[PDB]
Design a protein around this ligand. Structure first.
Ligand SMILES: *[C@@H]1O[C@H](CO)[C@@H](O[C@@H]2O[C@H](CO)[C@@H](O[C@@H]3O[C@H](CO[C@H]4O[C@H](CO)[C@@H](O)[C@H](O)[C@@H]4O)[C@@H](O)[C@H](O[C@H]4O[C@H](CO)[C@@H](O)[C@H](O)[C@@H]4O)[C@@H]3O)[C@H](O)[C@H]2NC(C)=O)[C@H](O)[C@H]1NC(C)=O
Ligand SMILES: *[C@@H]1O[C@H](CO)[C@@H](O[C@@H]2O[C@H](CO)[C@@H](O[C@@H]3O[C@H](CO[C@H]4O[C@H](CO)[C@@H](O)[C@H](O)[C@@H]4O)[C@@H](O)[C@H](O[C@H]4O[C@H](CO)[C@@H](O)[C@H](O)[C@@H]4O)[C@@H]3O)[C@H](O)[C@H]2NC(C)=O)[C@H](O)[C@H]1NC(C)=O
Ligand SMILES: *[C@@H]1O[C@H](CO)[C@@H](O[C@@H]2O[C@H](CO)[C@@H](O[C@@H]3O[C@H](CO[C@H]4O[C@H](CO)[C@@H](O)[C@H](O)[C@@H]4O)[C@@H](O)[C@H](O[C@H]4O[C@H](CO)[C@@H](O)[C@H](O)[C@@H]4O)[C@@H]3O)[C@H](O)[C@H]2NC(C)=O)[C@H](O)[C@H]1NC(C)=O
Ligand SMILES: *[C@@H]1O[C@H](CO)[C@@H](O)[C@H](O[C@@H]2O[C@H](CO)[C@@H](O[C@@H]3O[C@H](CO)[C@@H](O)[C@H](O)[C@@H]3O)[C@H](O)[C@H]2NC(C)=O)[C@H]1NC(C)=O
Ligand SMILES: *[C@@H]1O[C@H](CO)[C@@H](O[C@@H]2O[C@H](CO)[C@@H](O)[C@H](O[C@@H]3O[C@H](CO)[C@@H](O)[C@H](O)[C@@H]3O)[C@H]2NC(C)=O)[C@H](O)[C@H]1NC(C)=O
Ligand SMILES: *[C@@H]1O[C@H](CO)[C@@H](O[C@@H]2O[C@H](CO)[C@@H](O[C@@H]3O[C@H](CO)[C@@H](O)[C@H](O)[C@@H]3O)[C@H](O)[C@H]2NC(C)=O)[C@H](O)[C@H]1NC(C)=O
Ligand SMILES: *[C@@H]1O[C@H](CO)[C@@H](O[C@@H]2O[C@H](CO)[C@@H](O[C@@H]3O[C@H](CO)[C@@H](O)[C@H](O)[C@@H]3O)[C@H](O)[C@H]2NC(C)=O)[C@H](O)[C@H]1NC(C)=O
Ligand SMILES: CC(=O)N[C@@H]1[C@@H](O)[C@@H](O)[C@@H](CO)O[C@@H]1O
Ligand SMILES: *[C@@H]1O[C@H](CO)[C@@H](O)[C@H](O)[C@H]1NC(C)=O
Ligand SMILES: *[C@@H]1O[C@H](CO)[C@@H](O)[C@H](O)[C@H]1NC(C)=O
Ligand SMILES: *[C@H]1O[C@H](CO)[C@H](O)[C@H](O)[C@H]1NC(C)=O
Ligand SMILES: *[C@H]1O[C@H](CO)[C@H](O)[C@H](O)[C@H]1NC(C)=O
Ligand SMILES: *[C@H]1O[C@H](CO)[C@H](O)[C@H](O)[C@H]1NC(C)=O
Ligand SMILES: [Ca+2]
Ligand SMILES: [Ca+2]
Ligand SMILES: [Ca+2]
Ligand SMILES: [Ca+2]
Ligand SMILES: [Ca+2]
Ligand SMILES: [Ca+2]
Ligand SMILES: [Ca+2]
Ligand SMILES: [Ca+2]
Ligand SMILES: [Ca+2]
Ligand SMILES: [Ca+2]
Ligand SMILES: [Ca+2]
Ligand SMILES: [Ca+2]
Ligand SMILES: [Ca+2]
Ligand SMILES: [Ca+2]
Ligand SMILES: [Ca+2]
Ligand SMILES: [Ca+2]
Ligand SMILES: [Ca+2]
Ligand SMILES: [Ca+2]
Ligand SMILES: [Ca+2]
Ligand SMILES: [Ca+2]
Lengths: 1089, 5, 72
């Protein structure tokens, strides 16, 4: 029994000062008429005070007009004072009410009919007419934007010399094409038009419109996008009269002498409506609970500090300092009326300043971070810098477990997940199957689970800490609009107290999402002002969510729900990738500079660089007991009773049983029955632990936990691990399984008993025949199923596009962002409706995207200056020397293109003019790299591997003078090969040193199975490779003449010489004596057969 | 690109 | 140019046909005159001031002939 490090027992309270634990004559003119005071003129009724002198009358408008003394009634429906209408007035577009308020084109509209004497083109919205006379039908020119006019059962001709062929089979003169107008209804004349740029007299909208300057701020949307009526384009700054002046009600500035001088200098009495009455002293209108101040002419209230003023300008409200300004108190903050209290989380002591929280533990934190080949051991102050592991492929992410001191990491090259104790013992692999592309992982120290994100499958996974019971938790999209979906999931953090999982995505619609650890409550947290969120983490003592952005260059934090986003670094970071929090400090890694930085977590002050790195640092964690806070496991014992995964409920109060992927979650009231439901291409373990792929069955290693994977009576394993074995012993790749093509020589790979219940991956769709294809290949106008079941017209008409995607008219499904991007992604232009794309609903995000000049395409700002035609206008590359590169992380090429510094001297051209790879000094090879003669750095694992990696065999020298890693087998020539390939029956050393000393594999002396010829040097080759002219085994026994007598000759492939050897056809008449007898060069075969 | 691991 | 709904529709055709500008200008002139008459006619419809069909025929007569002099 112990008191937890720096903490107190659960039955005690902790004094925050030190940390000590304590116990808890009208000429007959009167019929509807009045007099004009003239002997010949008569005012008709209602026309007096109409606003116009309609008659020469002196009683018309002598300021006797009452606007709304008597108003119109429902007998003539009212729309404005003195103006009322009915009938078809209410929606016709005529100026009825004097201001078109008679309809406003809103009320009682959107319901119409058209007579039979006309033709109703109903497919037109009220701005376009929907009824044209029958004479207009096929009169010669169209009148509806629907444009069925000229195509309603009417003929055509074979075009004209000066006309353009529209897609609707009609021709029109070429002067109308590329003019930004629908001259044949379907915009066919507008497809592929490189519109000219706008001139000085023309304002340019978001979409290419080239509108003249008159309509700018004319309060009418003329661009279609509202670009001509932007709020900040029509910006009217407030005239303030700052110095000893005064701001009149009408906007005038007058000098101080012109205030309270009994003269209206402002023409609105703003300087004289006062001067002697003190409303603050009125003590009745002041109503200020706090103090008041009566200026020259009027009063105002003013709140005491800790209180905020609001709309009423009289009252005060307590500021919620712990939410409005969390920067005040490190760690927990408690709001009070008019003030606040800072409290340190348990385990931290409150320094007397009231704002510093110091860790009470005696354990000193350090940073574990990963490079390409290395996991490294760096203290928080940067003083000590050592290596934890080396020789790893690509450590893209890692995490640690406090409970039993294990380190977990993802090797993105081998696509495996490993774990190891922090004393560098018991290194083992837990996940080595599927795992197309894992990017970020997090270890659940509470419920003893592992979570990770897959980028290719676009999924969130969960697994046990030993790797068993893999389950797919989240997929597809996260919001109800289906706007934000799994595109490039990167960065993951857990909050077991609330039972949530947080992750970020740098796809086109970048967001930060939250989900329950059982998958129930997926939602969007941050979705605005975010482009490349590569980093995410939580401060557990503050319930603050920290994330970074590689494009906008900021580090920002907000509450757990996503409100109150406070910026720490105002976009000055080149390219952060991962970050972590401890006490009051942010640690993060930059890719452009390849450095690990450090700074204050609330304002970024004290920024210092901890260390360089020759490779990009990916993942960083502060290893300390405080970074994984102690709480009680909801699945107390027996996994809460579940036979499979016990997962924490959202909110962190309950728990939920769940089953692995290939299982059915059959629900009862007492139990969730996990009934295995694996496909016919999988093998089920006897104890129902898991269903493994069928090619793992009887492969020589125990894949099943109970040992049922390797029963006694299954045939000798010919193939390697991870290869499928046909019934006759020949070998095929697993992808050959049920691909509708005969790979096995006997068709073992396509048996109905194997492929009848075959199931495809989550990112692939199954054809009519069981072949699996990627889902993006369906309805793509190419036969991919070999029976055209992916391109079936009925299937394409009935299918539904994946969430977050958009379906074309021809059944093609494309990403949502590809819609309205001035590109024919659908082939039939169904994704580019000009009337809809040119609307404000498809604007470019001012914060992050750039708008092309002559069209409506939006591109991300990081595509500018890149050297590519991102806008089809080529308008994102013009004059791009004006933009400045980043002050510290960007190297500028000679052609004014900015590139990240990490690409400088990387060995490849990234500018185009090769200015980055010039004046270049070769870099220093790191700890586990080996340096070639030409100063190139290669992994040390590549030395003496029988491959010319440097380019001149500089890494292949003096191999027999050295040993190698213990997992390898050293050949006679000194080269090293993995141990598993040694004593396996095939020559893997080029000298065949392996298999040259292994004992008999059988008792009757035979080294190889009877089906295969065994060479005298104890290697096995397949019997049809014999006598083929190739030394398939180094002893030459597979080409010896005498033992080659027992073979026929295949005339369409081989031809017999004077020697019984039957060389391949291309050696006949080749000019080289191949058989050694000149029979291949007998010239009678080099003529016409 | 510039952000792919 | 015109308040009238269906006269705006007719007026667009003559621009598309590129008729004689002087006759085109005169075409706007009488249509502007007619729209006042047309609104006056259907002002009577809400006022109930005609039941003999005069104020409809007089306007469609000119319009029908305008269809001939301008192809409409
Ligand atoms: C690197 O760091 C790791 C983690 O700290 C070390 O691993 C631990 O090593 C210790 C010492 O061997 C282990 O402690 C012993 O475990 C025995 C069995 O534990 C069971 O339960 C644990 C927890 O679930 C399981 O991990 C484990 O598999 C077993 O199921 C206990 O029976 C031992 O206690 C008994 O015997 C000792 C004397 O041997 C008595 O003093 C005790 O009173 C008691 O009678 C003991 O506790 C521990 O299990 C290991 N943990 C893990 C996770 O494996 C590595 O050893 C360390 N490497 C080096 C080289 O230092
Ligand atoms: C897939 O894996 C197998 C095994 O690794 C590879 O080699 C096959 O192995 C068998 C077993 O030796 C071969 O069978 C032998 O083939 C000889 C020629 O075969 C042709 O002619 C016979 C008729 O004479 C046909 O049945 C056959 O389909 C071919 O058209 C036969 O002459 C041999 O028969 C002699 O021995 C047997 C006993 O072994 C006696 O019963 C006979 O009386 C006779 O004495 C023998 O049948 C087989 O030919 C190999 N190939 C094939 C295609 O199976 C395969 O090469 C590999 N897949 C491929 C295509 O590479
Ligand atoms: C030294 O020792 C080794 C190991 O014991 C021997 O190798 C075995 O040799 C025997 C006899 O030739 C082989 O048995 C025969 O295999 C044929 C092909 O194998 C297929 O079928 C088996 C059994 O289902 C599968 O395991 C395998 O994957 C193949 O799909 C069979 O067709 C033969 O059956 C025929 O003969 C038997 C009687 O022998 C009849 O009952 C059948 O009806 C049928 O007519 C037979 O099973 C065996 O495959 C070899 N095993 C290995 C591991 O190589 C060497 O022969 C022995 N001698 C020397 C000096 O090397
Ligand atoms: C306006 O702002 C002034 C300061 O510029 C405040 O003085 C005033 O509120 C007053 O605050 C003072 C100081 O807190 C209070 O004075 C009390 O005096 C007692 C001895 O005479 C002493 O024992 C108390 O601790 C206080 O110091 C005072 O009560 C308080 N209120 C008033 C009505 O003066 C601000 N005025 C308001 C109402 O917002
Ligand atoms: C990351 O770096 C730090 C600093 O280099 C490492 O801390 C020290 O590492 C050494 C060598 O691994 C440990 O021995 C030290 O802890 C030990 O603790 C026991 C028990 O008190 C003592 O008997 C030992 O004499 C020693 O002090 C350790 N020191 C501290 C204060 O942490 C850290 O281990 C390293 N992490 C990894 C994963 O290697
Ligand atoms: C997808 O997200 C958008 C934006 O958040 C949601 O659009 C919003 O939906 C409401 C109700 O449909 C819209 O009200 C409607 O606006 C139009 C145009 O002004 C008007 O003609 C209708 O009478 C109605 O008032 C609202 O404008 C719109 N925008 C916002 C920000 O509220 C939408 O609900 C989400 N889901 C769907 C189904 O698209
Ligand atoms: C499941 O997910 C939803 C959406 O992410 C969560 O809803 C949000 O929950 C927070 C915290 O309860 C709410 O904040 C609160 O809002 C209320 C007003 O509605 C306010 O009075 C509180 O002081 C607090 O600010 C937030 O409004 C709410 N949003 C919505 C639209 O639901 C929900 O809490 C999650 N539930 C679980 C099990 O985690
Ligand atoms: C020094 C020592 O033995 N510390 C341990 C500590 O690691 C933890 O197990 C604690 C639980 O109450 O009790 C004790
Ligand atoms: C990192 O590299 C730069 C440039 O070589 C160097 O000036 C700086 O001192 C390095 N940082 C450290 C901590 O050595
Ligand atoms: C648009 O950009 C401006 C700065 O020019 C910014 O202040 C404003 O917040 C942005 N608006 C939107 C919609 O993001
Ligand atoms: C297509 O999507 C709809 C919803 O939009 C249904 O979910 C339907 O089941 C989907 N079809 C397939 C093939 O799953
Ligand atoms: C042989 O070389 C390998 C190269 O990784 C190791 O350095 C190994 O320790 C060496 N063996 C001996 C005995 O020095
Ligand atoms: C061959 O190896 C086996 C084991 O695989 C036995 O050791 C046997 O004694 C060896 N020799 C012979 C003649 O089979
Ligand atoms: Ca009047
Ligand atoms: Ca109207
Ligand atoms: Ca027509
Ligand atoms: Ca056009
Ligand atoms: Ca405008
Ligand atoms: Ca004055
Ligand atoms: Ca407060
Ligand atoms: Ca993806
Ligand atoms: Ca984006
Ligand atoms: Ca950047
Ligand atoms: Ca196996
Ligand atoms: Ca196949
Ligand atoms: Ca296809
Ligand atoms: Ca498109
Ligand atoms: Ca570009
Ligand atoms: Ca370069
Ligand atoms: Ca090599
Ligand atoms: Ca071998
Ligand atoms: Ca050979
Ligand atoms: Ca030859």
């Amino acid at each position: 029994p112990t008191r937890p490090p720096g903490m107190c027992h659960l039955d005690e309270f902790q004094c925050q000062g030190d940390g000590t634990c304590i116990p808890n004559a009208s000429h007959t003119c009167r019929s509807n008429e009045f007099q004009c005071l003239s002997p010949q003129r008569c005012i008709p009724s209602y026309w007096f005070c109409d606003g116009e002198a309609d008659c020469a009358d002196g009683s018309d408008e002598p300021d006797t007009c009452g606007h709304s003394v008597n108003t119109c009634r429902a007998s003539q429906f009212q729309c404005d004072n003195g103006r009322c209408i009915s009938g078809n007035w209410v929606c016709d577009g005529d100026n009825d009410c004097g201001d078109m308020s008679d309809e406003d084109q809103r009320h009682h509209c959107e319901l119409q009919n058209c007579s039979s004497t006309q033709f109703t083109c109903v497919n037109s919205r009220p701005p376009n007419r929907r009824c044209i006379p029958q004479y207009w039908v096929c009169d010669g020119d169209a009148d509806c934007s629907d444009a069925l006019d000229e195509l309603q059962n009417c003929t055509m001709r074979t075009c004209s010399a000066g006309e353009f062929s529209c897609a609707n089979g009609r021709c029109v003169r070429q002067s109308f094409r590329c003019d930004r107008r629908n001259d044949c209804g379907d915009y066919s004349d507008e497809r592929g038009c490189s519109y000219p740029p706008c001139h000085a007299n023309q304002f340019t909208c978001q979409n290419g419109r080239c509108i003249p300057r008159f309509f700018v701020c004319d309060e009418d949307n003329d661009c279609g996008d509202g670009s001509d009526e932007q709020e900040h384009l029509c910006h009217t700054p407030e005239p303030t009269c700052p110095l000893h002046q005064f701001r009149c009600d009408n906007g005038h500035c007058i000098e101080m002498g012109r205030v309270c001088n009994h003269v209206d200098d402002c023409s609105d009495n703003s300087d004289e409506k006062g001067c002697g009455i003190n409303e603050c002293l009125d003590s009745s209108i002041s109503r200020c609970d706090h103090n008041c101040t009566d200026t020259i002419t009027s009063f105002y209230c003013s709140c005491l500090p800790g209180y905020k003023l609001m709309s009423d300008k009289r009252s005060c409200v307590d500021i919620d300092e712990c939410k409005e300004s969390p920067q005040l108190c490190s760690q927990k903050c408690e709001n009070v009326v008019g003030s606040y209290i800072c409290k340190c989380a348990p385990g931290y002591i409150r320094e007397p300043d009231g704002k510093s929280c110091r860790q009470n533990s005696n354990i000193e934190p350090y940073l574990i971070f990963s490079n390409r080949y290395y996991i490294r051991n760096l203290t928080t102050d940067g003083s000590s810098y050592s290596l934890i592991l080396q020789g790893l492929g690509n450590v893209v992410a890692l995490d640690f477990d406090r409970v039993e001191k294990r380190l977990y990491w993802i090797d993105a090259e081998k696509q495996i997940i490993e774990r190891m104790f922090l004393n560098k013992t018991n290194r083992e692999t837990i996940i080595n199957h599927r795992l197309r592309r894992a990017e970020s992982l997090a270890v659940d120290w509470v419920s003893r689970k592992l979570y990770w994100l897959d980028a290719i499958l676009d999924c969130l996974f969960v697994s046990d800490l030993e790797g068993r019971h893999r389950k797919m938790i989240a997929q597809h999209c996260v919001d109800a609009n289906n706007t934000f979906c799994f595109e490039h999931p990167r960065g993951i953090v857990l909050h077991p107290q609330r039972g949530h999982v947080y992750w970020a995505d740098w796809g086109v619609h970048a967001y930060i999402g939250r989900i329950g650890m059982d998958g129930t409550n997926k939602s969007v947290i941050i979705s605005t002002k975010i482009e490349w969120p590569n980093a995410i983490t939580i401060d557990y003592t503050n319930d603050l969510l920290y994330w970074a952005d590689a494009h906008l260059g900021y580090i920002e934090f907000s509450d757990l729900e996503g409100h109150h986003r406070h910026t720490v670094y105002d976009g000055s970071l080149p390219h952060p990738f991962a970050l972590t929090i401890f006490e009051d400090t942010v640690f993060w890694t930059d890719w452009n500079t390849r450095t690990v930085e450090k700074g204050n977590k609330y304002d970024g002050s004290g920024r210092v660089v901890l260390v360089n790195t020759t490779h990009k640092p990916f993942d960083i964690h502060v290893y300390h007991p405080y970074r994984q806070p102690i709480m009680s496991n909801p699945c107390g014992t027996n996994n809460g009773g579940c036979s499979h995964l016990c997962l924490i409920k959202a909110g962190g109060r309950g728990f939920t049983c769940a089953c692995p992927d290939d299982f059915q979650t059959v629900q009862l009231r007492d139990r969730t029955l996990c009934m295995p439901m694996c496909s016919s291409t999988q093998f089920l373990c006897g104890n129902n632990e898991k269903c493994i792929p069928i090619w793992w069955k009887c492969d020589g290693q125990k894949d099943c936990s109970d040992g049922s994977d390797e029963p006694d009576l299954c045939p000798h394993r010919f193939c390697r691990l991870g290869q499928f074995q046909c019934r006759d012993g020949n070998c095929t790749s697993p992808q050959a399984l049920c691909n509708a093509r005969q790979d096995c020589a006997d068709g073992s790979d396509e048996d109905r008993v194997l492929c009848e219940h075959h199931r495809c991956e989550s990112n692939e769709w199954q054809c009519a025949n069981k072949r699996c294809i990627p889902q993006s290949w369906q309805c793509d106008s190419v036969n991919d199923c070999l029976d055209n079941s992916d391109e079936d017209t009925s299937h394409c008409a009935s299918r539904t596009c994946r969430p977050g995607q958009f379906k074309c008219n021809n059944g093609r499904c494309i990403p949502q962002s590809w819609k309205c991007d001035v590109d024919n992604d659908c082939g039939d232009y169904s994704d580019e409706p000009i009337d809809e794309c040119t609307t404000a609903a498809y604007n470019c995000d001012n914060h992050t995207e750039f708008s092309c000049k002559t069209n409506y395409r939006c591109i991300p700002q990081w595509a500018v200056c890149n050297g590519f035609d991102d806008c089809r206008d080529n308008s994102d590359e013009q004059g791009c020397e004006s933009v400045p590169c980043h002050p510290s992380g960007d190297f500028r090429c000679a052609n004014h293109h900015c590139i990240p510094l990490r690409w400088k001297c990387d060995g490849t051209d990234d500018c185009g003019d090769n200015s980055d790879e010039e004046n270049c000094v070769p870099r220093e090879c790191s700890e586990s790299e080996f340096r070639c003669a030409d100063q190139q750095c290669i992994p040390s694992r590549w030395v003496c591997d029988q491959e010319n990696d440097c380019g001149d065999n500089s890494d292949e020298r003096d191999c027999e003078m050295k040993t190698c890693h213990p997992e390898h087998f050293q050949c006679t020539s000194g080269h090293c090969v993995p141990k598993a390939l040694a004593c396996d029956g095939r020559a893997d050393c080029l000298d065949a040193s392996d298999e040259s000393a292994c004992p008999t594999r059988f008792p009757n002396g035979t080294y190889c199975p009877a089906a295969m010829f065994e060479c005298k040097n104890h290697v096995c080759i397949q019997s049809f490779w014999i006598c083929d002219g190739e030394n398939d085994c180094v002893d030459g026994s597979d080409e010896e003449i005498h033992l080659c007598f027992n073979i026929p000759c295949e005339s369409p492939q081989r031809f017999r010489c004077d020697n019984s050897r039957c060389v391949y056809g291309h050696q006949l008449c080749n000019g080289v004596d191949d058989c050694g007898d000149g029979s291949d060069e007998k010239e009678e075969h080099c003529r016409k057969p | 690109x510039x952000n792919x691991x | 140019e015109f308040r009238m709904e269906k006269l705006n529709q007719l007026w667009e055709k003559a621009k598309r046909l590129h008729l004689s500008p002087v006759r085109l200008a005169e075409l706007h002139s009488d249509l502007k005159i007619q729209e006042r008459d047309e609104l006056n006619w259907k002002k009577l419809k809400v006022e109930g001031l005609d039941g003999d069909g005069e104020k409809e025929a007089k306007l469609v007569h000119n319009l029908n002939v305008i269809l001939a002099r301008y192809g409409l």
